[PDB]
Amino acid sequence: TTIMAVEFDGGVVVGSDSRVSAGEAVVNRVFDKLSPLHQHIYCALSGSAADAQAIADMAAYQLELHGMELEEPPLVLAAANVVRNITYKYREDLSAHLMVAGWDQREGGQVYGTMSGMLIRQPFAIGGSGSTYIYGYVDAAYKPGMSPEECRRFTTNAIALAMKRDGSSGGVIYLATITGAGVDHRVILGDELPRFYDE
Amino acid sequence: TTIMAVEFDGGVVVGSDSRVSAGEAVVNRVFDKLSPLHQHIYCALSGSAADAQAIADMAAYQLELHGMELEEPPLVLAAANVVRNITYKYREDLSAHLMVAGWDQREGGQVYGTMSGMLIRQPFAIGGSGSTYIYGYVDAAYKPGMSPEECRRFTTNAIALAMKRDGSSGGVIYLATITGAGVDHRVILGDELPRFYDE
Amino acid sequence: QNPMVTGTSVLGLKFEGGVVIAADMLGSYGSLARFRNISRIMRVNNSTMLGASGDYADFQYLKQVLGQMVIDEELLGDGHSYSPKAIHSWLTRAMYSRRSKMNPLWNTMVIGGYADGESFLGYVDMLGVAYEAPSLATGYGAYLAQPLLREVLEKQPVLSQTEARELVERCMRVLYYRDARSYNRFQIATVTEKGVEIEGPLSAETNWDIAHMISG
Amino acid sequence: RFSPYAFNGGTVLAIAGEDFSIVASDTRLSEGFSIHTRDSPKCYKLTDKTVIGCSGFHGDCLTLTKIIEARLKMYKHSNNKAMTTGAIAAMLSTILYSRRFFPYYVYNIIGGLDEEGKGAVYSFDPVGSYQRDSFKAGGSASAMLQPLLDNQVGFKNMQNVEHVPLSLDRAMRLVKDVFISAAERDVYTGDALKVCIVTKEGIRGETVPLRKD
Amino acid sequence: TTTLAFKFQHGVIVAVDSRASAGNYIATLKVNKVIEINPYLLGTMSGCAADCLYWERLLAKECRLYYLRNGERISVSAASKLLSNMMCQYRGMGLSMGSMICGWDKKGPGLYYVDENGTRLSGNMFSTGSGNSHAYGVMDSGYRPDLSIEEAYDLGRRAIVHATHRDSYSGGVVNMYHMKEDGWVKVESTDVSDLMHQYRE
Amino acid sequence: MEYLIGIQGPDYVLVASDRVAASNIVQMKDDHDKMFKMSEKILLLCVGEAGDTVQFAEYIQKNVQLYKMRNGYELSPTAAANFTRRNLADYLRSRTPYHVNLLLAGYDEHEGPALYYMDYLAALAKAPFAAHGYGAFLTLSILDRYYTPTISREKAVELLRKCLEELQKRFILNLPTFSVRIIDRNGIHDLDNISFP
Amino acid sequence: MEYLIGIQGPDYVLVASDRVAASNIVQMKDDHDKMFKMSEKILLLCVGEAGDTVQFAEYIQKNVQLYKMRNGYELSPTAAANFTRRNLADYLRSRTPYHVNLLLAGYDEHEGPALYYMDYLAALAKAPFAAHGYGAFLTLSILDRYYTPTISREKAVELLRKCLEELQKRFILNLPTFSVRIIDRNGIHDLDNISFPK
Amino acid sequence: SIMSYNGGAVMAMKGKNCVAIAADRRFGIQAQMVTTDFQKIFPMGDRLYIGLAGLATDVQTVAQRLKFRLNLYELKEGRQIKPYTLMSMVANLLYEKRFGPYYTEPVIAGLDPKTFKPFICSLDLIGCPMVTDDFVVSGTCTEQMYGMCESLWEPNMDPEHLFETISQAMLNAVDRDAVSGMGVIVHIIEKDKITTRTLKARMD
Amino acid sequence: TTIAGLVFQDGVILGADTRATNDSVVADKICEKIHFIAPKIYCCGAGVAADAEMTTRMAASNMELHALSTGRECRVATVTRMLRQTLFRYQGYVGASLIVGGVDFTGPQLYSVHPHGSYSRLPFTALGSGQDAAIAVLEDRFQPNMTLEAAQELLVEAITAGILGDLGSGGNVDACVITAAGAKMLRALSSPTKPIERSSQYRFAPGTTPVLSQTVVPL
Amino acid sequence: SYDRAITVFSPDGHLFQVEYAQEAVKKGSTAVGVRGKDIVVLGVEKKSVAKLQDERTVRKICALDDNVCMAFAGLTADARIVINRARVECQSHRLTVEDPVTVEYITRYIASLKQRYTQSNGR
């Protein structure tokens, strides 16, 4: 369970891992944890897979009903608030944790950590049990003002480093990049994963 | 509790954190965790600080006699079996886990993780609660056969970022570098801690 | 309920015609120090302010409720403002109902305020303990900075902004040493007759020379 | 996890003289072995003749204080009269039982003048029982103050000694010295002493210092 | 804490002590356990002190309600009957109350025992409380169905004396209440300690 | 643990209840009658947790009294236990589960005298004789030896003394005083209370 | 629970006990003898766990007989108590602590009759009367009423039955069969075992 | 808990040239008492006495062990033991059992076997030596016994004020403790004599 | 219980208070804490009271053995090694906590002994319940190699924290100063509690106690 | 649901709805009753059926309890609801109080229902 988000000038980059693990026996090793909140707005699931999927559709609904009323995509801040208001409400019976990121025609690329039901604005956010060991790598490698390709470098390498140590994180990477033009998708295969020091 | 040991040809770099915490409170903000077992043999204390110090004297005791019989300082691997055989017997009573390092006229620099009464050799070894967060960090910047001063900086960089990320660790950096002509001792002030990403 | 974003010590002290409040910018998840940039202090109208400890998540929810309540009086234009008392009174009563419902918001909050030359400072607890003291601390700061404050308050009960903030600079300097969950970044919020003035992030110069004195 | 209440210490003792009632308690408020503040008055005046201290968990004291005053002034405007010292007793007793399944942890001692002008003391308990007595105590030091109460006021365990009705001068000597003795040996009492005395004219309140530790 | 009462041809005598303690520490020596309901109805106290106060005062309201309703001066059996109902509502919620019901009606000086679960028991001779076991022995040695009112008090005094003597939780001073047709009367409030020298020698 | 016992003859139903109500080491009321009357020809005997006996018995008792007023006739013994079982089963899973073990006796112009056994889980059974409590061990085994379908009601009580005396001899708890009643087409007939002077 | 009682008179000590031993819901044997003869002028009773009574009694009983052989004269009641206590307190810290409630009776050549009280906590208390078990709740209040240090032995037997029959009138256990033995200047004598003609 | 299980209490106060020691006579298990004949104060010899409280199990057990080790030291030296020497004897007898602790709270009082000097002390389950020039209190009523002794104590007291003070304490103290009771025995060591007086106390 | 110490240029200082309690009430106000081991060596206890008592005695008993046999000065760190080796045999089950300081031939050595056997070398530390407040003063205002006079005045204000800041500490403060010249002891250096007075006195004449029975045994 | 006032006042103050209710009372069959010395006796006339009806359902003299009985004259419709719910009160009173029912106690609870039905919404 590893999710990642990085902010830059024109937009944000959101990575994810495909391993869905419960216990020591993998349940489903191939899955796409990216759940669209909207065409221009996405979220990153974490924690319990089943409980997180329900909040995604309950958020993608309330956001869609508000979207067509003004005929404009809601602000990224409005997306994090809906995720927070739903999370914090049921947070006692739901252990799911989410990561909200998106782009708008005003503010631009934004990332808001919803973890545990709080709200925070960060240039980069990590979550899950696999991200616990990447706190060291994210500090030295990250520098502001990186291009989307340079961001995907820092994004993929940090996730390719994550899934090695964590037992509950693995599989392939699903990337999403939202800019003024549109949405991009990149899938990094196990052999396509950048390989690090294994000794 | 954050301890770090890195091997290279000319010697070993053994780092440690000065902060020792009892529960949520700090025992002593500056406490030296490096206790020599033998002349050139040193030990990295972790787990329970008390039990680790009692093992240090029982080790050093047995090393005295056995060191006087050969008229030669016992090899690093010899002290590894000493600490382990005492740890494996008391493993239920003694919960402390030690990281053994040292240098000898034959094998050279050797670091042996004794955690849970086992025996292994590694290019670099780390232990404690705060050593977890630096896994991916060191893995990106680690290269075989780095220069000793940069190895001293590599351990200085790692632990420094661990103390900021770990709430249970902190204080000042210790540096133990063993050579053929002696042993180096370094204490880095809190003002001289390597500065990493602040935000 | 869960280990969610636990906070740190919260320090405050009265002075002449104002209140000094200081808190670290570090959020802490479990034993890990995770979020090193967060906003602990909120400005409430001109004369009042709030800062908290414990769960930062549950705070933002109650932090948001205050904002909507302040809007109610601002829309009226009645010519009045919320006093630090009433806010401290509403907060104690609002957090109280959380205990009777067995779902308490887990926090420790401090309210600074300035009313007609009399600066009010107050303290609340999750369980509802509330009082007024010239020096207030939270967590292990109550075991460290609190006796240091009361040592100076005996000789200098009346203080200005000069020595107050300068003493607070020395208060959090100890919080590095004996408080493991503290962090370098901190905020200094001062409430005066001109309203709340919140300075940006600051650091502290410390002396570690005790390390080199061990080998002696 | 979560504890519904924690023992905060504190001590409240109220003695009712012939025509007067004296109520004195410290200002020391603590949590476990940790001290909050040295000024935390327990005694809370309600009406002219009614002042009540509450010894126990301090947060539950404020909620009762507000609910009481909420019923007090509601009684006033509706009933066009103030509540007597004896009337507040049975009122708060019914207030405590409504919460019986979530018991308030406090020791409530009512004091003031009755309809006849005599000093009245009503001691409560967290479950809501009530009784009237000449002298009551509360808190942690309440156990240590009883022999001195059974001596000066009680006159028990002496051989042919005249029983004098207690006086204000003796009370100021008694009530202070028993606290001076209690604050020494008991850790939860000290740092100050406040005294609330109510006569037919009104309240008379003064503060006398105790040992700082 | 000891509460005992017993029914006999001349009415009922209620004998309790004054000491109600919290743990090993004595709360107050002078605590009055016996509670007033009506001129002809007298209540008791056992276990939780507040549960006896509230419910018997609520029953005192119920005793007034029906009396303000049908003015029939409700019977003693119906009293404990109404008390049993209201207690069975919260049964299982943690209410622990021992108590007794004393009164006089057309049937006679009715005596009833009420438990926490709503158990309603009439009878000639009762007892309850912590140290009640010490009361049964001394009270059951000899019996006269028709009691002489004086020696009847002595049988009630000597009971409480040796009862509170063995029990650490029973003590304080003696409380004694006789029952009569029109209304009950309080016999005496007497120290337990000074009653020993009589029986001791 | 109070003790109930009952025996159904061809023309009669013999029931016996211990009169002792005790708490801890003392007997509260030793003569207290546990036998309750549902209707003229139908009684009920209950044993279990103290408050559950008294309280729950009034439910079945008062509600059957309401039936006779509407239709002009009493319930049958079969309808009795039925109405008793469902009400006890509906309240079994409720917030306040009742602990009671009851024997239901009654007479009918066709089914004759009837005896129905019921546990604390409201499991109905039709047996010639049954008992409750720990005393059922020391007693019902004796009845298995000496019982016959043709037994007269006179030898019934004569036989019951053999089972009751074992309670004073081997069985630990006192239970000095016993109540005895019998029901037939002529209605309830009370009998002597067996005591051991 | 089984019940013990004893009374010390000026020239005598009278002891009485229930002979019924029970397990589960039934009473197995009503003739079980609690009263044990330690020596000529000394006699012992006990109550406790079913197996520890007879087990621990013979040890204290026969060890006194070994002393009587060496010096030729039997122990005094006072010496038997402190020798019983210290031996009973030693078994507490072992793996099998004995549950014991006992009454020690004997006739000294000087002090005359003596009665001693001990419990499973091994606490020796010299008292003219004592009780054990659940009956100590329903009985000892009767003794303080009718007892005097000058009481005659025949008044004791009378008042004894008044204390004993209380168990069937109130206490839940039957315990019909009782036993009676007494010690005096002439040593151990026996009296008719108290029964209850129901 | 276990300390308050079997009850008991003891008090000792030191005067000018004399010292007094007192303890309650009540003995019994929890709610039900037994008898007043349990003795909590035992003679240690001339001008030396010891009180005991807590669980009466080890009270009488430690006692017989005290005189045991004492009778050895009595004959081995030509002169009798001092109270300050006995204090460590009781502390060491309790400490060897530290891992299976005895339950008691010993209190020692007496005079210097040389001439006039009084001495008192108090201990606990751990047996920490504590020397006070005023008084020592031990028992389940200890909290109540600090109240009177703080007020009543005087810098210098004759045998008169000695007997008066400590007696008023115990009589007032026990009143609030339901566990302690049933009379108090008072011992006073004078220069040329020693007295024992049984107090008339509340019966409860 | 609050105990603390510091090292100055010419030696060491060990502060302590006199308060002893049983976690509800004060057992003794004047009860001593600092003990005597060797002529130049002192120590103080914390945690469980008596567990420090016998531990220091058995440690000091081995000193006079060691001392008289060697005829040499007593080594500071030797006393520290005795304790923890004795405490580790109990696996930290003993709640005793100690501070060891003194003067040897080399120089001032101040240690601290934790219950589980952990030990540390350091200029200053505090133990007990009120250790927190007492540490705060020693952290900020400490200076390297302080003068004895400034070191004593720092100890005064030091324990003021643990006294005024914690309930489990109080009474008076007995200063302990050790130099190379010999041993020195002080008692009640500071009196933080002024109200030692009382407004009422109870003194009863002989005959006010209703005594029942009496007996007199002359010596 | 159906919520409105049914019975309302008039310019002369009298109740239209209630007077028409007592009119239907007089339109019913004639029933009588008296309070005897040691007994009570009730009676009601029977409209003469011709060789058809069964007298079980036609009987207008009922019994609420062993202590108290009743008779009714008016619309047979509303009579059976009162008889049923009054017998419920008779058993509920014995369920609440061990003492038997009182004629005055049961009577007031009966007429109190008709007062509720008058002032209740939609009734």
UniProtKB/Swiss-Prot annotation, chains A, B:
It comes from the Eukaryota. One of its GO terms (molecular function) is endopeptidase activity. The keyword Translocase does not apply. This is Proteasome subunit beta type-9. InterPro entries: Ntn_hydrolases_N, Pept_T1A_subB, Proteasome_bsu_CS, Proteasome_sua/b, Proteasome_suB-type. Induction: Up-regulated by interferon gamma (at protein level). Keywords: Acetylation, Cytoplasm, Hydrolase, Immunity, Nucleus, Protease, Proteasome, Threonine protease, Zymogen. The modification N6-acetyllysine is found at residues 33, 89. It catalyses: Cleavage of peptide bonds with very broad specificity. Its EC number is 3.4.25.1. The active site is at 1 (nucleophile). Pfam families: Proteasome (PF00227). Its main location: cytoplasm. GO terms for biological process: immune system process; proteasome-mediated ubiquitin-dependent protein catabolic process. The proteasome is a multicatalytic proteinase complex which is characterized by its ability to cleave peptides with Arg, Phe, Tyr, Leu, and Glu adjacent to the leaving group at neutral or slightly basic pH. The proteasome has an ATP-dependent proteolytic activity. This subunit is involved in antigen processing to generate class I binding peptides. It is found in: Cytoplasm; Nucleus. It is an enzyme of class 3 (hydrolase). Belongs to the peptidase T1B family. GO terms for cellular component: cytosol; nucleus; proteasome core complex; proteasome core complex, beta-subunit complex; spermatoproteasome complex. Autocleaved. The resulting N-terminal Thr residue of the mature subunit is responsible for the nucleophile proteolytic activity. Encoded in the MHC class II region.
UniProtKB/Swiss-Prot annotation, chain D:
The 26S proteasome consists of a 20S proteasome core and two 19S regulatory subunits. The 20S proteasome core is a barrel-shaped complex made of 28 subunits that are arranged in four stacked rings. The two outer rings are each formed by seven alpha subunits, and the two inner rings are formed by seven beta subunits. The proteolytic activity is exerted by three beta-subunits PSMB5, PSMB6 and PSMB7. Interacts with SERPINB2. Interacts with RFPL4A. The keyword Nucleus applies. Glycans are attached at residues 30, 181. The modification Phosphotyrosine is found at residue 122. Its main location: cytoplasm. Keywords: Acetylation, Cytoplasm, Glycoprotein, Nucleus, Phosphoprotein, Proteasome. This is Proteasome subunit beta type-1. The modification N6-acetyllysine is found at residue 176. Belongs to the peptidase T1B family. The lineage of its organism: Eukaryota, Metazoa, Chordata, Craniata, Vertebrata. GO terms for cellular component: cytoplasm; cytosol; nucleus; proteasome core complex; proteasome core complex, beta-subunit complex. The modification Phosphoserine is found at residues 34, 40, 134. It comes from the Eukaryota.
From Swiss-Prot, chain F:
The modification N-acetylmethionine is found at residue 1. GO terms for cellular component: cytosol; nucleoplasm; nucleus; proteasome core complex; proteasome core complex, beta-subunit complex. Pfam families: Proteasome (PF00227). SUPFAM superfamilies: N-terminal nucleophile aminohydrolases (Ntn hydrolases). The keyword Nucleus applies. The keyword Acetylation applies. One of its GO terms (biological process) is proteasome-mediated ubiquitin-dependent protein catabolic process. It is found in: Cytoplasm; Nucleus. InterPro entries: Ntn_hydrolases_N, Proteasome_beta2, Proteasome_bsu_CS, Proteasome_sua/b, Proteasome_suB-type. Keywords: Acetylation, Cytoplasm, Nucleus, Proteasome. Belongs to the peptidase T1B family. The 26S proteasome consists of a 20S proteasome core and two 19S regulatory subunits. The 20S proteasome core is a barrel-shaped complex made of 28 subunits that are arranged in four stacked rings. The two outer rings are each formed by seven alpha subunits, and the two inner rings are formed by seven beta subunits. The proteolytic activity is exerted by three beta-subunits PSMB5, PSMB6 and PSMB7. PANTHER family: METALLOPROTEASE TLDD, PROTEASOME SUBUNIT BETA TYPE-1. This is Proteasome subunit beta type-2. It comes from Bos taurus (Bovine).
UniProtKB/Swiss-Prot annotation, chain I:
It is an enzyme of class 3 (hydrolase). The 26S proteasome consists of a 20S proteasome core and two 19S regulatory subunits. The 20S proteasome core is composed of 28 subunits that are arranged in four stacked rings, resulting in a barrel-shaped structure. The two end rings are each formed by seven alpha subunits, and the two central rings are each formed by seven beta subunits. The catalytic chamber with the active sites is on the inside of the barrel. Component of the immunoproteasome, where it displaces the equivalent housekeeping subunit PSMB7. One of its GO terms (cellular component) is proteasome core complex, beta-subunit complex. This is Proteasome subunit beta type-10. The modification Phosphoserine is found at residue 191. The chain holds residues 40 to 258 of 273 of the full protein. The gene is PSMB10. Its EC number is 3.4.25.1. One of its GO terms (molecular function) is threonine-type endopeptidase activity. Keywords: Acetylation, Cytoplasm, Hydrolase, Nucleus, Phosphoprotein, Protease, Proteasome, Threonine protease, Zymogen. Signal peptide: none annotated. Belongs to the peptidase T1B family.
